Design a protein around this ligand. Structure first.
Ligand code: 3PE
Ligand code: NDP
Ligand code: EHZ
Ligand code: SF4
Ligand code: SF4
Ligand code: SF4
Ligand code: ZN
Lengths: 339, 172, 114, 198, 116, 112, 84, 83, 385, 145
């Protein structure tokens, strides 16, 4: 049944079963929507509470999506999820380090275990998602850790696809938003005033379409990829683009990363969810990456979508009424960088 | 025959102003609702005293089985040719005894309308429509009944079905 | 052969209506984007309008063009008013639908249907 | 098992059918009292307002109420749609059917002037079959979706349409989608091949 | 009034049929043939216009037959070749008329089987 | 006399005998301009005549009503006034003429 | 079954006899398991009793004007209750 | 495996369905229950089989137990009758 | 003015309506009701379904009146076949038709009140409606969309205890009506909210095709149960409750009277129901009895063909109207000789009534419109079909 | 025919025999119409079938059990209006109202006999002849069915 037997759409089948582990958060809800609209079964392992997995139940058709509970501490949950799949996708990743899990676990130990069972179960593809510009000694606890794992993944389950996306924008993101949120607290306290650091941002759908195409693309095997996105923007300009599109006053008062590092520490202390933290602060200001030679969305078949276009949808909320109705051509025009 | 529905001495004029000023006529309604808090509520204790039904009550389908143990369904297709919601697919074979039985039977209980056109068409009394009505489900897949969720279903209520069939067979 | 006119007698006469609708729509697209908080750009939409008014650009039976205007105008009424929500209007853009390939090799490669 | 019927009616109504045919010779093409004891005056489409006005306002035939306006679509006939107007006389306790024929591209007049009941029924006939009613105040879709394309009750329209709807998270809207049905509708070819002796 | 026009009355744009179901689809006007299983000739008298047969596949969950051909269960019934060709041309479909096949007259006699 | 004609709108009309005579007599005239032998003129003049015949033969309203076999006279009038309007309207639509166009072939054969 | 005082409360407040017309079924209800029933069922040729084939295809058809049917006889006020 | 097969092949991805779940399968196969029944001996050449009931059983068909070689089996009950 | 689209979800009316309104300050300038929110395609689907397997489409057109909708179709299919139901069946249809008029009116009067704001009348009557459902459940098997009044008769005989239980309900129901009667008829608040609101003049009501209590409320004399009798109504005696001053109140009072008059008709049906069979028994039209199909071959063939193929009603077309509780419900069934219909135009008393909302609710404030929809007894299944 | 039955007596039963692996003769169904006997003798020249016995136990089956082995054999199914002898492979896989019928051409043999392929839910359930005066006049081969 890897023979797709139907007109494309729900109720067809493209015959690729898949275990998409991080399908409770931000990126996986789009992956299930594409894998799903592609009518492929998706065994979605959820450790969450069912009330929060419902939003996934309609992104599929009768029987397409199957759910089962998995906790990273114990295997056999990883084993049974990947037992009947042929595709496996890893989207596990947390910004903060909850008392129970370290960047160690969510980025190395776990993906390793999943991939372990993946190879053990015979799944052909272990699409894994590590961050762009994320290598060892990248001076950020997570990014460094993330790359360490990329190796563990490769070692155990070779011939694996590894996507390393740039910052991911799109609704419900924590990229544009973190910057947008600054409105609430004072003004944007951008380090380097936001200059001197450039970020390539890619829409969630562009990454999601890429992961789906990769699961079904033969040449993709053993191929790393970088989903950079269409334009490289300096941080100060992008925060200014978030503002104006947010329609709230902008003030890029500077300060050193070390202060903001000490600062976020406290925000991280927040028990529920850090509003920001040292690791995040770092990956924003210092983190900057120039892709050089990796296939990318175009290669995998996606036309990266510029941020100039789909920014209404993710910032139209952050406007006060009386500005909500503001259209796009009105939005403060942005500009791209090379650096 | 037709009936009209809506068609001054001081005695009458004072009476009108005694029913407009010292309202006396909204009082005949307040005493009317006071007449009901003192009566016995009709509410039944629901989970413990389920309401009354009839042997005719049409609910969850089930496939009856001959007392011997032989499925009664002989795959006529006299019950999807009438099922107006177009809910039943009963692909069949010779069962390798030489006999005639289903390999497939189906209701999509999210399309059925509990009309009982399948229990009155069946010339053998195989498919019935039982007196269940507590079979709600948290998912969509638990309503697409197969021949084994209808046959063991009918291997459940047969003590409770046959009493109602035997109770209504004459009227049918 | 002879045929009663629906509203116009000669194709030319009717086209007068076809243009009096184009203008209307054109002058409305801007309004809709803003009113229905649609996200597509004025230019983008106005493109769609031409496309449609263009899609039908081959019939020569006045009665048919006399009829598509009406249907056409009706669609304005609804859109001019907000009788149609965002969902309705945005459906003209096949946002989710994956455009079907046309190349033979592109179809042979997928789906037994031609 | 044979209807209890009154022959008085067949005759009385037949006689009215000749009366209407004599009073309006220019528009009535055929009048017939069926054996169900009902009357049907078939009029040329141009006679829609003259024939119905005579019946609404004639002392010997007052047909004040419009029971319904509907359009059977026989695809074979050249003029497919057969608009049918059923009218009731409270004064004489009798009912009449005036039916005329309209093609896809030839509109028929609107009786909203004769009966204001038809303002809605005519909108439904346009939405369902595509017949257009001339000088009809506010003709526009009564029953179909705001963006619906195609006239649904036409015999040439697929039962289940071409578009269906679903909520797509990626776009957060109810998006349409070419119709894919999980179980096609088994079309049963149930129709006997031994005709009944008339 | 009485304007004159010269088209085959293509109402393809008034019908509302998605292009791909008006372009790549062939109607087949034909008078249905008799069910050899029975000898009734009442189902072989009116001309039908049925469309092409596209994919009928299997629903992965329950094994039912699924389809994406909206015009699959469509069998318009006319009363003459002339009135079917007209409708298809009217709606912009391609046709494949098949002439009627009435049995020819075959002479039957009881005695014949008694000759020697 | 009558306080209220049952129907809501129709209001009691005093001088029923009079209003009618005028409406009926006007009509008997509008029919005149109709072609000599037009069913409408031949039949509507047969009715209007009988009602004018009773409108003047009997002077008690309730009585009159039974004869005209209508509802409240306030109705016999409502109708007399509408026939007049049809009579005016008919003289323009000239229904008496020969059929406009015979149905296309087979446009009235139900078992198709 | 209610304390007489409480029920006289409902009869006096309602203004109507209330023990008689109960909205609750105590013994008023027919008991279930009604005894089994026996439902009631020459020259019975179907050709004589043919409702389906009896019908015929529709008939197609100085002088005095004719109404569609004799004018409807006006009703008369109800004897038991003319006005309510 | 159901009385009619259906057992999913180990590789079939159609097995996820039953994970954290199970499979509705009737243990009482009618192929065997009917075989666990005594061949109904009869005296007459032909016998009826109302399905052990009048109007509560199956349409009434007469079976020809005429050859001991074969025990007639009413096509409805699968009951073998031994002449 | 201000275009406030009355809620499609709004608790008022039947929740399937939009009713865009122009608010000239407090008053409503114009109403443009946007129905279509429940058009399931009932008339399209019936063409693809045999005559028996379409009856169900009908009890689901006006779900408040179940068995009267069916009684139309059943009358229409019977006339096309030239067969008549047996005598007992005709009384049973009149017995069930009057129970449906009581239940529709309990629906219309009590739901109008909760829209107005009176909440208790609904609860007292709805318990009386559950008693009546039980009568449908104890004759058909369902409490709703019973599919009991089929072509040729009812599907099955009345159970051995139904007529005694219908007497006990009818015996005590009358007190329940005037209990609502005292609650709403004389209240200052109800009369002010209902009297002189949505007055419709007699000729306008006929012209707009109102044809229902809306027609009779304005004083026009027409019931369709005494004008063009169906079934055995010609043998039962009742008084049409016509009214003057065509205002919501007079229309309310008429609906309360018809509930009372229906108890008079139910009283006669229990007193005079004939011994007999419930379905015409020419097996070509109504299916053969369970014992007969299992013992005689002609009956098995007739059961097999009727359930699988159909009645095959003779070619023709008919418009049959019965007085459904809302108003004249009519089916224009066009039939080819085939077992499945060709067209079935359901005339809905309600498509005409909702059209009248703009004319009837003119010079009226937002609150009056809630009463105007309530007094048309419109349920959107019949209008949307 | 008639709405009811007046036969309050006992029915007859015949004994199912084996005429081959293609024709299932549940001949208690037979209305002794002798179509089978004729076809077997006038179209197919195989005179193996015949009537045996007189009275109400005239059974139209081979006196000795010799299978009806010939091409043109399956046509008996199509020609027996009763379902006494029907097809054994297509025994109980379907029921005719459901079968969607598409008219096509025989490719097994070069006579190119016209045939109707009866398909249900997308798999062919039976192929039965459709009449072509010149090529196959209502008959098809045992192979192409
Ligand atoms: C001669 C001696 C010297 C002079 C002495 C003084 C002169 C004589 C005084 C006589 C006073 C008579 C009563 C006047 C006060 C009562 C209120 C009133 O005047 O009625 C107004 C209104 C009438 O309603 P309606 O019929 O619409 O009349 C207007 C018509 N356009 O009424 C209403 O409709 C209001 C309805 C609102 C809803 C009421 C619901 C029932 C409330 C029951 C309350 C029960 C408890 C009341 C007592 C509480 C005590 C704390
Ligand atoms: N812009 C971006 O977001 C970018 C992301 N990436 C990478 O892509 C991946 C997906 O990102 P995104 O989805 O936004 O990250 P999220 O914060 O949304 O987390 C992804 C999913 O992983 C699950 N998860 C998190 N921690 C654990 C744990 N300890 N055990 C089990 N499950 C867990 C979460 O579910 P639950 O709620 O149950 O914890 C969540 O649904 C990440 O791993 C990240 O490294 C790379 C570049 C940019
Ligand atoms: C954003 C919402 C999208 C809605 C778009 C709009 O409402 C839909 C619509 O165009 S409504 C149908 C328009 N269709 C016509 O109006 C007929 C045109 N008629 C021709 O095109 C002729 O062939 C002609 C001879 C004129 C060619 O000449 P030309 O190429 O036009 O110049
Ligand atoms: S259930 Fe009754 S009807 Fe449906 S197939 Fe089995 S036997 Fe025939
Ligand atoms: S009940 Fe009516 S719908 Fe449900 S299955 Fe039996 S027949 Fe089909
Ligand atoms: S043809 Fe069929 S029925 Fe006629 S005899 Fe041969 S077998 Fe018996
Ligand atoms: Zn048996």
């Amino acid at each position: 049944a890897v023979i797709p037997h139907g007109k494309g759409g729900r109720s067809s089948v493209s015959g690729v079963v898949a275990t998409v582990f991080g399908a409770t958060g931000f990126l996986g809800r789009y992956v299930v929507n594409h894998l799903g609209r592609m009518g492929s079964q998706v065994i979605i392992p959820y450790r969450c509470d069912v009330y929060d997995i419902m939003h996934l139940r309609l992104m599929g058709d009768l029987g397409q999506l199957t759910f089962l509970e998995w906790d990273a501490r114990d295997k056999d949950s990883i084993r049974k999820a990947v037992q009947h799949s042929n595709v496996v996708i890893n989207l596990i990743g947390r910004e903060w380090e909850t008392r129970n899990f370290d960047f160690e676990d969510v980025f190395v130990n776990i993906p390793r275990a999943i991939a372990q069972a993946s190879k053990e179960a015979g799944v052909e593809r272990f699409i894994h998602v590590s961050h762009l510009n994320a290598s060892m000694k990248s001076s950020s606890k997570s990014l460094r850790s993330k790359a360490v794992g990329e190796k563990e993944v490769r070692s155990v389950f070779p011939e694996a696809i590894i996507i390393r996306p740039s910052d991911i924008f799109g609704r419900e993101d924590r990229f544009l938003n973190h910057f947008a949120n600054y409105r609430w607290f004072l003004a944007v306290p951008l380090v380097s005033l936001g200059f001197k650091t450039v970020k390539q941002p890619v829409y969630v759908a562009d990454v999601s379409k890429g992961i789906v195409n990769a699961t079904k693309d033969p040449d993709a095997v053993g191929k790393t990829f970088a989903f950079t996105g269409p334009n490289r923007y300096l941080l100060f300009h992008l925060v200014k683009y978030i503002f104006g599109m947010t329609h709230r006053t902008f003030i890029p008062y500077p300060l050193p990363l070390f202060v903001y590092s000490w600062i976020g520490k406290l925000f991280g202390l927040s028990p529920f969810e850090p509003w920001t933290t040292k690791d995040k602060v770092e990956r924003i200001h210092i983190s900057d990456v120039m892709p050089t030679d990796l296939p990318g969305l175009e290669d995998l078949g996606v036309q990266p979508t510029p941020l100039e276009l789909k920014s209404i949808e993710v910032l139209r909320r952050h406007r006060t009424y009386r500005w909500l109705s503001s259209e796009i051509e009105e939005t403060k025009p942005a500009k791209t960088v090379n650096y | 025959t037709y009936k009209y529905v809506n068609k001054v001495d001081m005695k009458s004029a004072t009476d009108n102003a005694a029913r407009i000023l010292m309202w006396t006529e909204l009082i005949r309604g307040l005493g009317m609702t006071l007449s009901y808090l003192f009566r016995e509520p009709a509410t039944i204790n629901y989970p413990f005293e389920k309401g009354p039904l009839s042997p005719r009550f049409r609910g969850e389908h089930a496939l009856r089985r001959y007392p011997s143990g032989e499925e009664r369904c002989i795959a006529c297709k006299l019950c999807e040719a009438i099922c107006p919601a177009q809910a039943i697919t009963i692909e069949a074979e010779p069962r390798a005894d030489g006999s005639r039985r289903t390999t497939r039977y189906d209701i999509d209980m999210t399309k059925c309308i509990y009309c009982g056109f399948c229990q009155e068409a069946c010339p053998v009394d195989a498919i019935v429509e039982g007196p269940n009505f507590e079979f709600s489900t948290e998912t969509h897949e638990e309503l697409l009944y197969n021949k084994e969720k209808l046959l063991n279903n009918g291997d459940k209520w047969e003590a409770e079905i046959a009493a109602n069939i035997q109770a209504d067979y004459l009227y049918r | 052969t002879s045929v009663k006119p629906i509203f116009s007698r000669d194709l030319n006469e009717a086209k007068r209506r076809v243009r009096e609708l184009y203008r209307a729509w054109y002058r409305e697209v801007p309004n809709t984007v803003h009113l229905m908080q649609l996200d597509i750009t004025v230019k983008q939409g106005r493109d769609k309008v031409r496309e449609m008014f263009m899609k039908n650009a081959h019939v020569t039976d006045p009665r048919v063009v006399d009829l598509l205007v009406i249907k056409g105008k009706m669609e304005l009424q609804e859109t001019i008013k907000v009788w149609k929500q965002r969902t309705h209007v945005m459906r003209f853009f096949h946002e989710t639908e994956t455009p079907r390939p046309k190349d033979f090799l592109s179809k042979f490669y997928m789906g037994h249907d031609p | 098992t044979v209807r209890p019927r009154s022959d008085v009616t067949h005759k009385q109504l037949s006689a009215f059918g000749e009366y209407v045919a004599e009073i309006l010779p220019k528009y009535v093409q055929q009048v017939q009292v069926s054996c169900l004891d009902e009357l049907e005056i078939c009029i040329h489409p141009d006679g829609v307002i003259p024939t119905l006005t005579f019946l609404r306002d004639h002392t010997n035939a007052q047909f004040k109420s419009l029971a319904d306006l509907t359009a059977v679509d026989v695809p074979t006939r050249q003029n497919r749609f057969e608009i049918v107007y059923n009218l009731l006389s409270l004064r004489f306790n009798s009912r009449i059917r005036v039916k005329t024929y309209a093609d896809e591209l030839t509109p028929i007049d609107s009786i909203v002037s004769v009966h204001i009941a038809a303002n809605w029924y005519e909108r439904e006939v346009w939405d369902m079959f595509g017949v257009f009613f001339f000088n009809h105040p506010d003709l526009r879709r009564i029953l179909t979706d705001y963006g619906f394309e195609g006239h649904p009750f036409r015999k040439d329209f697929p039962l289940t349409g071409y578009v269906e709807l679903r909520y797509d998270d990626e776009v957060k809207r109810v998006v349409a989608e070419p119709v894919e049905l999980a179980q096609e509708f088994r079309k049963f070819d149930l129709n006997s091949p031994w005709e009944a002796f008339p | 009034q009485l304007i004159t026009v010269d088209e085959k009355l293509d109402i393809t744009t008034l019908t509302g049929v998605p292009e791909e179901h008006i372009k790549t689809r062939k109607v087949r006007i034909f008078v249905p043939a008799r069910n050899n299983m029975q000898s009734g000739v009442n189902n072989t008298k009116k001309w039908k216009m049925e469309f092409d047969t596209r994919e009928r596949w299997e629903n992965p969950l329950m094994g039912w037959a699924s389809t994406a051909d909206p015009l699959s269960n469509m069998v318009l019934t006319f009363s003459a070749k002339e009135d079917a060709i007209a409708f298809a041309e009217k709606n912009g479909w391609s046709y494949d008329v098949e002439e009627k096949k009435v049995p020819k007259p075959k002479s039957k006699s009881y005695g014949a089987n008694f000759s020697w | 006399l009558k306080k209220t004609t049952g129907l809501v709108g129709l209001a009691v009309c005093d001088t029923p005998h009079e209003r009618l005579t005028i409406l009926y007599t006007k009509t008997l005239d509008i029919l005149k301009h109709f072609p000599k032998h037009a069913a409408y003129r031949k039949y509507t003049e047969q009715i209007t005549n009988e009602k004018l015949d009773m409108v003047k033969a009997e002077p008690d309203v309730k009585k009159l009503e039974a004869l005209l076999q209508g509802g409240e006279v306030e109705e016999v009038i409502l109708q007399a006034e509408k026939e007049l309007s049809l009579a005016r309207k008919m003289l323009k639509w000239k229904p008496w003429e020969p059929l406009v166009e015979e149905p296309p072939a087979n446009q009235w054969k139900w078992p198709i | 079954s209610a304390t007489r005082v409480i029920q006289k409360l409902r009869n006096w407040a309602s203004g109507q006899d209330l023990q008689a017309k109960l909205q609750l079924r105590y013994q008023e209800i027919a008991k279930r398991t009604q005894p089994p029933p026996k439902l009631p069922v020459s020259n019975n040729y179907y050709c004589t009793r043919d409702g389906r084939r009896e019908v015929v295809p529709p008939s197609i058809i100085e002088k005095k004007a004719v109404t569609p049917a004799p004018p409807m006889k006006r009703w008369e006020l109800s004897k038991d209750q003319p006005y309510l | 495996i159901t009385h009619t097969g259906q057992v999913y092949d180990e590789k079939d991805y159609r097995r996820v369905r039953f994970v954290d779940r199970q499979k509705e399968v009737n243990e009482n196969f009618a192929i065997d229950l009917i075989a666990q029944q005594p061949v109904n001996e009869v005296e007459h050449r032909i016998i009826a089989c109302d399905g052990g009931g009048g109007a509560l059983g199956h349409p009434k068909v007469y079976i020809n137990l005429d050859k001991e070689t074969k025990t007639g089996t009413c096509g409805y009950c699968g009951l073998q009758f031994k002449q | 003015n201000m275009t406030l689209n009355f809620g499609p979800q709004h608790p008022a009316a039947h929740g399937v309506l939009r009713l865009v309104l122009e608010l000239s300050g407090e008053m409503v300038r114009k109403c443009d009701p946007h129905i279509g929110l429940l058009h399931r395609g009932t008339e399209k689907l019936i063409e693809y379904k045999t005559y028996l397997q379409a009856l169900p489409y009908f009890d689901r057109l006006d779900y408040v009146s179940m068995m009267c909708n069916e009684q139309a179709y059943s009358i229409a299919v019977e006339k096309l076949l030239n067969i008549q139901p047996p005598p007992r069946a005709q009384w049973i249809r009149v017995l069930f038709g009057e129970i449906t008029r009581i239940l529709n009116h309990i629906m219309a009067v009590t739901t109008h009140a909760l829209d107005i704001g009176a909440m208790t009348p609904f609860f007292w009557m709805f318990e009386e409606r559950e008693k009546m459902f039980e009568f449908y459940e104890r004759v058909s098997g369902a409490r709703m969309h019973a599919a009991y009044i089929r072509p040729g008769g009812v599907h099955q005989d009345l159970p051995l205890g139904l007529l005694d239980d219908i007497y006990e309900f009818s015996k005590n129901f009358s007190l329940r009506i005037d209990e609502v009667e005292e609650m709403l008829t004389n209240n200052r608040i109800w009369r002010n909210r209902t009297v002189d609101i949505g007055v419709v003049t007699a000729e306008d009501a006929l012209n707009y095709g109102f044809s229902g209590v809306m027609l009779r409320g304005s004083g026009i004399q027409w019931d369709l149960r005494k004008t063009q009798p169906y079934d055995v109504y010609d043998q039962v005696e009742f008084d049409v409750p016509i009214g003057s001053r065509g205002d919501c109140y007079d229309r309310y009072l008429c609906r309360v009277e018809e509930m009372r008059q229906s108890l008079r008709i139910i009283e006669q049906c229990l007193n005079k129901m004939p011994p007999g069979e419930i379905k015409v028994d020419d097996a070509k039209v109504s299916p053969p009895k369970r014992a007969e199909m299992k013992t005689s071959m002609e009956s098995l063939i007739h059961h097999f063909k009727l359930y699988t193929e159909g009645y095959q009603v003779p070619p023709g077309a008919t418009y049959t109207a019965i007085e459904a509780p809302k108003g004249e419900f009519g089916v224009y069934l066009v039939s080819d000789g085939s077992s499945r219909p060709y067209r079935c135009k359901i005339k809905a008393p309600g498509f005409a009534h909702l059209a009248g909302l703009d004319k009837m609710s003119k010079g009226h404030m937002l609150a009056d419109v809630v009463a105007i929809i309530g007094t048309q007894d419109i349920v959107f299944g019949e209008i949307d079909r | 025919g008639s709405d009811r039955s007046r036969f309050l007596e006992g029915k007859r039963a015949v004994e199912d025999k084996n005429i081959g692996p293609l024709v299932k003769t549940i001949m208690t169904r037979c209305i002794q119409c002798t179509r089978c006997i004729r076809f077997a003798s006038e179209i197919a020249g195989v005179d193996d079938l015949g009537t045996t016995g007189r009275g109400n136990d005239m059974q139209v089956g081979t006196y000795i059990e010799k299978m009806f082995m010939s091409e043109l054999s399956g046509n008996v199914i199509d020609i027996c209006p009763v379902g006494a002898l029907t097809s054994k492979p297509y025994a109980f896989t379907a029921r005719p109202w459901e079968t969607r019928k598409t008219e096509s051409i025989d490719v097994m043999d070069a006579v190119g006999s016209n045939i109707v392929v009866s398909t249900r839910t997308g798999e062919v359930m039976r192929i039965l002849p459709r009449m072509h005066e010149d090529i196959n006049e209502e008959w098809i081969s045992d192979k192409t069915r």
